[PDB]
Amino acid sequence: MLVLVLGDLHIPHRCNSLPAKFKKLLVPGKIQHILCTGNLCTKESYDYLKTLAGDVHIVRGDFDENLNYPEQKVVTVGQFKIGLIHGHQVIPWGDMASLALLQRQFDVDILISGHTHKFEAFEHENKFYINPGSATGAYNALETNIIPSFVLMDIQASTVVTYVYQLIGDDVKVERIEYKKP
Amino acid sequence: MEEADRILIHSLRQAGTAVPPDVQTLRAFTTELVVEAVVRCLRVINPAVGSGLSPLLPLAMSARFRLAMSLAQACMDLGYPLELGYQNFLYPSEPDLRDLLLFLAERLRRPEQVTWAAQEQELESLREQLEGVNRSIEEVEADMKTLGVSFVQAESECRHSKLSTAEREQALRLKSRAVELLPDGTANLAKLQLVVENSAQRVIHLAGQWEKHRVPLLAEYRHLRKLQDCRELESSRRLAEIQELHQSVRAAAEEARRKEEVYKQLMSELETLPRDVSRLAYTQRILEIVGNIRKQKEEITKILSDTKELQKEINSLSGKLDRTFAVTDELVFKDAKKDDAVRKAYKYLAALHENCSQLIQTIEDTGTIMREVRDLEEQIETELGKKTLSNLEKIREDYRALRQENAGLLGRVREA
Amino acid sequence: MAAAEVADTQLMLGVGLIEKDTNGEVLWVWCYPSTTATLRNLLLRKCCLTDENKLLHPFVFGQYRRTWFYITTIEVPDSSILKKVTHFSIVLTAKDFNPEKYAAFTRILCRMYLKHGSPVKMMESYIAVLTKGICQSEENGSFLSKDFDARKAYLAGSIKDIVSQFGMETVILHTALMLKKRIVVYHPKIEAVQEFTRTLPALVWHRQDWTILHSYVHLNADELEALQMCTGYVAGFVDLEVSNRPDLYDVFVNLAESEITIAPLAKEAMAMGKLHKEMGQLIVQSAEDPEKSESHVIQDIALKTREIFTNLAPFSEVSADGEKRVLNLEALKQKRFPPATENFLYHLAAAEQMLKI
Amino acid sequence: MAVFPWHSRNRNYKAEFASCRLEAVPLEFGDYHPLKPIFPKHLLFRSLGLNLALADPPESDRLQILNEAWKVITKLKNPQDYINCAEVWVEYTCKHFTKREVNTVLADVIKHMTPDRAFEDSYPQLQLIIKKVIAHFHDFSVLFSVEKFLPFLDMFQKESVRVEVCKCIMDAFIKHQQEPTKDPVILNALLHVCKTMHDSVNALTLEDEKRMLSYLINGFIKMVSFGRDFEQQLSFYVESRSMFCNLEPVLVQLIHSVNRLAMETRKVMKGNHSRKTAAFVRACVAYCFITIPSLAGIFTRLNLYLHSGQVALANQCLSQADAFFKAAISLVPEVPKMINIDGKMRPSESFLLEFLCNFFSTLLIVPDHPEHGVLFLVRELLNVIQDYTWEDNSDEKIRIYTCVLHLLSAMSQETYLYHIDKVDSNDSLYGGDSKFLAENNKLCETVMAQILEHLKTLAKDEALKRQSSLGLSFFNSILAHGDLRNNKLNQLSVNLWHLAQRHGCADTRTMVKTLEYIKKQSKQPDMTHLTELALRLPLQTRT
Amino acid sequence: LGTSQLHRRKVISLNKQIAQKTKHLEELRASHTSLQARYNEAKKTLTELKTYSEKLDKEQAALEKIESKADPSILQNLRALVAMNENLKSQEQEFKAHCREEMTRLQQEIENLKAERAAMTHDEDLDRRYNMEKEKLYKIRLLQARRNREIAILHRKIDEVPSRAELIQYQKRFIELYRQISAVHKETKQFFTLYNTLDDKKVYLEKEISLLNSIHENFSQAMASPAARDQFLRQMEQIVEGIKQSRMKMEKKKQENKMRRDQLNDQYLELLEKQRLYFKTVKEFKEEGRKNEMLLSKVKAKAS
């Protein structure tokens, strides 16, 4: 099942278009679900997403003026519960220990963060934790440069195959893992 | 615009024109002050002209005009959007001056056949024996081959024969043994079986002894292995630790060098830096202003409400008034029909409500007129900001002086 | 009866064992046979536990220089043995075939040891079998060699299953087998190799020689030499590299493949002429013809064997050496067997060690 | 149990990274992935306009007809017929021929309409005319060349009508304008119209109309762009601010723009920050700084404040950030018990805490003033927070207390969870000052005092579920941050775990799975004292 | 005399080859002879083994002859037992030997693990070194903190007096701020006037309705009798008189404010015309300057 996960688009202030080949990679319709950790900021960006695939969910980050987005969500695809947060909720931003704290709160197999601003993808405690980075490469105040990066994953029941897209000029680099439900 | 007065201070400081004590406003100035500033302004910005006219004040009044015309030209250096000239350069309204000043501040039968034969015969004689020897050699080679095979053959048969002989020896020995056992077969059988079983018990004994001998050796082995690993891990860990600590210490020394040298730079910077009024001060001032904005905005906001409710009150009143007058006037006329003086009371009803409308209207008019008053007073403010009468007095005396001057010039033209 | 038990209790020359400890290492641990330190090293090379889990095959049986050897590994299952034992690999050494009966006696030994921990009581059981060819167990119902005649061990092989798997590859296999030719089997699963290869002595078994079954040969020089002692031979292997070697092999079987390989001259000696067509027919029936079980298939292969032996028999004279016949192979060609039948006759007379030269 | 001082676990986030990270394989050139893209005159005039729009002879003949018809029309003094029929013919005229052909019509329109108010009566016709222009005309620069449009605008009086035109015009502009560039004239005209809209605004106008209008303005605003001209960009912004006072959200855009300009300028300079760079920096800073007060949306203003903060952090403006914090602080009391958004009132405290959360992290990233008390600011913020009239469900307070301990833990770290560029922090100076560490711990202990106090109070309050969760977090935090080598604290953690279980409103499933997690973590070597904990932790259960 | 050198040369070659090959023959023949003796010897040995083997066979037949005298079963059991005992002696004795053997072997292996061990002092000295590094690192960090203190002090000192560049935005801000100050406050007070307006409108709406209803009912009461009706006529003329007094007071205010408005407006117009005069006189003076400079051109040319 093809599902799209994104965060912290910062569209109007930081990132008023997605780049060319990344946009291109967004073929509509070959995605089943869409999950946004927040700070995509605009309803119209969400429109562009919903036109990319209908099954959109968004949790409230900072700049998302729709405060009605939930702070968090437990989405489930394949056999995995999947926890959603804007890491602006993450105490030391990125603490693995806090991440497992979240998991134990919600008993979820995957979690995705967005507010953190490195590329992050740790699985330990046999639970998995993700930062795609900003797919628009919205500047990290703590950092000198971030390439925009985004992932789609082949979630298949007890297993998930990662596809870790990076745009490097015209270079769309990709990385794979398979996560599993042991 | 006292903040802009602080810009005056700013402009004076940047120009190097002083701020004499009451020179806290444009109001203070003489024209020279400004026009000097203009001299500085291009002399910084367009020296080619700007070098032209000394900050020295003129006294040839014509030079005052013409230098001022150079000021207009200085505006023409870019075209500040408004009118230019000595008229302005004489003592304009402070807004105008301020604006232009800002415009400035910004940009800163033959023998062979007989005997040769007998010679070559000597070759042939040896050639034949050579081939015969080679024949014999090949023969002996064949013989050695065959005999070696045969020899190995005999070797193989000998080995097998030995094997058979050993088997016969063992079988014969056993058969003799059985013959030895023949007289007491049953008793020998039982005795020997018992012997075998006891010997196996003795085997069991030794297996226990050898077991028990064995175990300590292994336990010690285990011990030495365990301490081996612990040592090996320990050493690895201390080594890694000290590697890291050394590297970090190195980086810290690098930073110390950088920090120390920068610090002396900072010493130089402290030496250089001025001591003006602070970021904070303006911050405070702004915030004050901010508060001002908030408060009066909010007061306007209450007023917004006040208007809303007040009008809906008036609305209710108007409806009640109209229905009131309908009912009242109906009854009054119904009564007026009875009698002429009741009709006079009805007359007073209509005239009274009319007079009400009259007074109301007059009040409205008063409001409007007072709005006019606001407008007029604003315009008065405008013209006094034009220093208007004083500027009359200025141009009267100026034009007087220059008319008189020009009359003298006409005289000189005719004379000279 | 008892004479066979006394032979066997000679052959069963005793038990091997290797284990692993917690200090960090797998180790040999003492046991009870007539040791050979060289051969001991060889057996260690047999030891699956030598790689803690390459494939920790929990049981192996084996034969070396006609000496059989028998093996069990369970790492450590739940038992009251000394917990220092992290892994275990129990073994025995023999000159005899009853792998199943050994599995029984070993299971007895092992479980007894799994209760006690002491190997010496288990050695009492070694002694018991030694003295009687039988053992009781405290942990188990008793075991008798009388339970398990060698021919029971021989019955276990399904020839139908193999022949239905290998068709004319089995015609390759046959033509190598009869003629005393060098047979190799490769599958990485030692369990499957064990099953298939041990079935392979069942084939033609009436032409009895069970000692052939050296179920685990290493490529070591001494081990390859030992296999060289054999000529008609079947040695089992779990890697491809033996396929490299038709100089070494007359056949390479990849049991990982279901494939059987022809050696260079075998491509004539096993070429599909008349007798090898007859064998193609017989093996197609050995898949297809249902009438006869593995031992019955052995009986009909014995029919073909008597055919070839009787072809040799009057044409051959019985030598002054008495045991065996000398074949007028020239007269056998005067019989004018169509060429593959006559060739198979010659190569089997070599396999019968009944040539004339 | 005395005021037993918290002491912390030590952690190598880098080692933790290497352990927890999964290493993804760099995928092969062109390899698969699921979305790899592998009978009066005018009557006939108008009737003829319909026929010609439908069918016509060649363009030359159309031109001839245009000349004849419009010439007569100019002769036609009657304005109503003139406007009515011209509206129809206009579409056809613009459809075929270039600008000037119509420009003549424009001139004569201006002539006929000028002397008499009736053009105001003809306001709709003027609107439709321009709408037709819109459909037929799409390149701005030509309209600027078609200067007749300015007299066209000038001809009007009715502000509202004009405003309508503006809405249409700018939406069409947006549909056409897809080029992020500039033209001063283009800017000038647009800005003039914008001010028309802005000034059209009053306090009384509907907020929704305000919003939409603003939003449109906002769109072109995004489009506004002069590339590499920070100062020009800046100034334009400044005045924009000056005029476009009528709606703050709009201004936030400007704010954002400032930020974007500044940050990118910073990046392109690559630390090679000249005097110009830093001054520019500070100016962005201020402009922004001053803006927020001008604004209204407090919460929004707060996150704006922190952005201001972080950019200053990005831009070396410590005390400046401090000021902003004081401001945030000052906003803190401002936060009312309920706030209205979407027309609706919601418990802000949830939201403010969310802010507070990201802020707290933000705290340690700061280099403090030597003069100022080491993180005094932090205490001020928290204390004030507590000073807020938090009702029940204060526990969120307790959550922050927890997390504050996580921060305190980072300060406790001789090395911080991240280190940013040129940024300094007390670590960067003090490198594990024992004294600082101790004081921090003391502060932690203060929080821990509050922790014990309210938790057992909640025990008095029978708030057993909420309190239970609070203990859940407390133990969880202790786990993350602590060393049970304080055997006393380890035991108090047991006291917690069973105390929670002895009141029992907690989710026993949570506790069971929790304990299982405790043992799973305890398995590690250092965790052997956690192993001592996790076994020494039995568990009372709803089960 | 017909004679060839090739005869000579190849003759010598042939003799050499003959002789050499013959010697090869001799050695090969000797080897043949030696192997012949060797092979024959093997044969003899073979015959010898056969004869001895035959003696063994004779011996076996005789021993088998003696054995025939009794139950073969008993004999077989005894033989088996003999072999059993033999095997036991063999493995037991051998095993004894292997017990000693393996004891020695492990003893040796342990002797290895001992000599392997019979890094720690290194570890201590490494700890010492490590401690020294941490210690100077802390004192270094002391200097870092101090220097950093200076860094902050000097930075703040720089920045407390912001750049003229900074001032730029400052003042333009101030400028809008004044604009706002004025605009807002004037708006504000004018709307306050608006308040006064609607306030007064409401007040008299209230008073009007109240008086209307009151006087309506007083009419209703009074009209009942001619005397009280006429009394209502007079009293209402008095009430309208007071109302008209309010009207006239408002009109008087209108006139007074009108007078103020007139006077100020007129002054305004006066000043407007005068300001026009002043700009005119500005022009007049500039004309005086132009005339001045023209005359100056004349004067300098003429006089100078």
* Domain ranges across chain B: 2-108, 128-180, 188-276
* Shared-domain flag, residues C169 and C280: no
Chains C and D touch (3+ CB pairs under 8 A): no
Q: Which residues contact E273 (CB under 8 A, 6 or more apart)?
A: none
Q: How close, in Å, is residue E145 to chain B by CA atoms?
A: 10
The number of C-alpha atoms within 13 Å of D52 and in the hemisphere containing its C-beta is 26
B374 interfacial to chain E (CB closer than 8 Å)? yes
Locate the DSSP E strands across C65-201.
Answer: 67-73, 87-93, 134-135, 143-144, 182-186
Residues C168 and C118 placed together within one structural domain of the fold: no
Cβ-Cβ contacts under 8 Å, E106 against chain C? none
DSSP state of D504: -
Structure token digits, residue E277: 């005069």
Of D283, D316, D318, the CB nearest to E165: D283
Residues of D in contact with B258 (CB under 8 A): none
Contact B265, E147 (CB under 8 A): no
DSSP label at C146?
G
Is the dihedral angle over the CA atoms D253, D258, D259, D264 positive or is it negative?
Answer: positive
Residues C113 and C184 in one domain: no
CATH number at residue C46: 3.30.450
- What does the alpha-carbon distance between residue A51 and residue D445 come to, in Å, rounded to a whole number? 52
C28 and C81 share one domain: yes
Q: Which of E83, E94, E102 sits opposite C6 (nearest CB)?
A: E83
Domain membership of residue C326 (yes or no) is yes
Element (DSSP H or E) covering residue B135: helix B117-180
Q: Do E141 and D318 touch (CB under 8 A)?
A: no
Nearest CB among A63, A88, A154 relative to D34 is that of: A154
Question: How far apart are the CA of D165 and the nearest CA of chain A, in angstroms?
Answer: 25
Residue A58 to residue A75: CA distance in whole angstroms: 11
Q: Within a domain: residue C356?
A: no
Question: In chain C, whose CA is at the least distance from the CA of E85?
Answer: C131
Residue from B194, B215, B225 to probe the interface with C (highest C Cβ count within 10 Å): B225
What are the φ/ψ torsions at residue D114 (nearest 5 degrees)? -40, -50
Resolution of the PDB structure in angstroms = 6.5
User: Taking CB atoms and an 8 Å cutoff, what residues of chain B touch E302?
Assistant: 412-413, 415-416
All structural domains of chain A, each given as residue ranges with its CATH number in brackets, are 1-182 (3.60.21.10)
Query: Which residues are A160's β-sheet partners?
Result: A155, A179
Inside any domain, residue D69: no
Could C2 and E80 be called an inter-chain contact, meaning their C-beta atoms sit closer than 8 Å? Answer: yes
In angstroms, the CA D507 to CA D511 distance is 6
Q: Quick check: is C357 in a domain? A: no
- Alpha carbon dihedral A155, D36, A18, A6, in 10-degree steps, equals 0
For chain D, after which residues does the C atom lie more than 2.5 Å from the next written residue's N, i.e. where is it broken?
A: 38
Is A117 annotated in a binding site? The answer is yes
Domain count, chain D: 1
CA-based nearest residue in chain C for residue E75: C3
Is D257 an 8 Å CB contact of chain A? yes
Residues 6+ apart with CB under 8 A from D345: D338, D339
Please report the DSSP string for D156-189 in residue order.
---HHHHHHHHHHHHHHHHHH-------HHHHHH
Contact flag B293-D323 (C-beta cutoff 8 Å):
no
* Structure obtained using: cryo-EM
Contacts of E102 in chain C (CB under 8 A): 30
Cβ contact (<8 Å) for D282 and E163?
yes
Q: Which of C124, C161, C131, C164 is nearest to C145 (CA)?
A: C131
Rounded-to-integer distance, Cα D332 and Cα B355, Å? 57
**One domain, residues C139 and C167:** no
Which of C104, C133, C152 delimits the end of a domain?
A: C152
Whether D33 has its CB under 8 Å from any CB of chain A: the answer is: yes
B316 touches chain E (CB under 8 A): no
Could D242 and E138 be called an inter-chain contact, meaning their C-beta atoms sit closer than 8 Å? Answer: no
D344 in reach of chain A (CB within 8 A): no
CB within 8 Å of chain E, chain D residues 159-188: none
Closest CA to E166 of D280, D242, B284: D280
* CA dist., res. D271 & res. B354, Å (int): 81
Whether C205 and C308 map to the same domain: the answer is: no
Confirm whether C93 is domain-assigned: yes
Which residues are within 8 A (CB) of C175 and not within 5 positions of it... i.e. 6 or more apart?
C181, C266, C269, C270, C276, C279, C344
What is the domain extent for residue C108? 2-152
Is A88 marked within a binding site? no
Chain E residues 46-85 within an 8 A CB cutoff of chain C: 76-77, 80, 83-84
Contact A86, A113 (CB under 8 A): yes
Any domain includes C335? yes
Nearest C-alpha neighbor of A149 from the set A129, A174, A128, A123:
A174
The answer to whether A62 is annotated as binding is yes
Instruction: Report in angstroms the alpha-carbon separations of B315 from B360, C26, D216.
Output: 16, 102, 37
E124 to chain C, closest Cα gap in Å: 25
* Interchain contact B218–C (C-beta under 8 A): yes
Q: Are C18 and C26 in contact (CB under 8 A)?
A: yes
**Residue D500 resides in a domain:** yes
Helix or strand (DSSP H, E) at C325: strand C325-327
What is residue E194's DSSP assignment? H
| Residue of E83, E94, E102 with shortest CB distance to C30 | E102
Say if D302 falls within a structural domain. no
Q: Rounded distance, CA A98 to CA C339, Å? A: 83
Q: Which amino acid would we find at residue C186?
A: Y
Q: Is A10 assigned to a binding site?
A: yes
**Distance between CA atoms of residues D297 and D335, nearest Å:** 11
Residues of chain B with C-beta less than 8 angstroms from the C-beta of D290: 286
State the smallest CA–CA distance between residue B265 and chain E in angstroms: 10
Residue D131 domain-assigned (yes or no): no
Q: Are residues C22 and C142 in the same domain?
A: yes
Range of the domain at D471: 462-543
Strands A55-58 and A33-36: parallel
- Show the CA angle centred on residue E57, arms to residues E55 and E58, nearest 5°: 65
**In chain B, what residues touch C135 (CB-CB under 8 Å)?**
none
User: Is chain C touching chain B, with at least 3 CB–CB pairs below 8 Å?
Assistant: yes
- Cβ-defined contact of D310 to A162 (cutoff 8 Å): no
Burial of D136 (0-12, 13-18, 19+ CB in 10 A): middle
Distance (Å, rounded) from C-alpha D259 to C-alpha D279? 14
E148–chain D nearest CA distance, Å: 6
Per CB-CB distance under 8 Å, the chain B contacts of E274 are 388-389, 392
Q: In this complex, which of E87, E94, E98 lies closest to C10 when CB atoms are compared?
A: E87
Contact D293 B304 (CB under 8 A): no
Closest partner residue to E176 among D242, D279, D428, by Cβ? D242
Q: Where would I find the beta strands (DSSP E) of C82-228? A: 87-93, 134-135, 143-144, 182-186
Q: Do the chains contact at B260 and E147, CB–CB below 8 Å? A: yes
Interface partners of chain B (CB pairs < 8 Å, 3 or more) are: C, D, E
Sorted by sequence, the CB contacts under 8 Å of residue E215 that are 6+ apart come out as: B349, B352, E236, E239
Q: Name the DSSP letter for residue C84.
A: T
* Count: domains in chain C: 3
Q: Is A115 annotated as a binding residue?
A: yes
If you search the block for the tokens 């105040």, which residue do you land on?
A141
> CA–CA distance from D155 to each of D106, D150, D172 (Å)?
12, 9, 22
E283 to chain B: nearest residue by CA?
B87
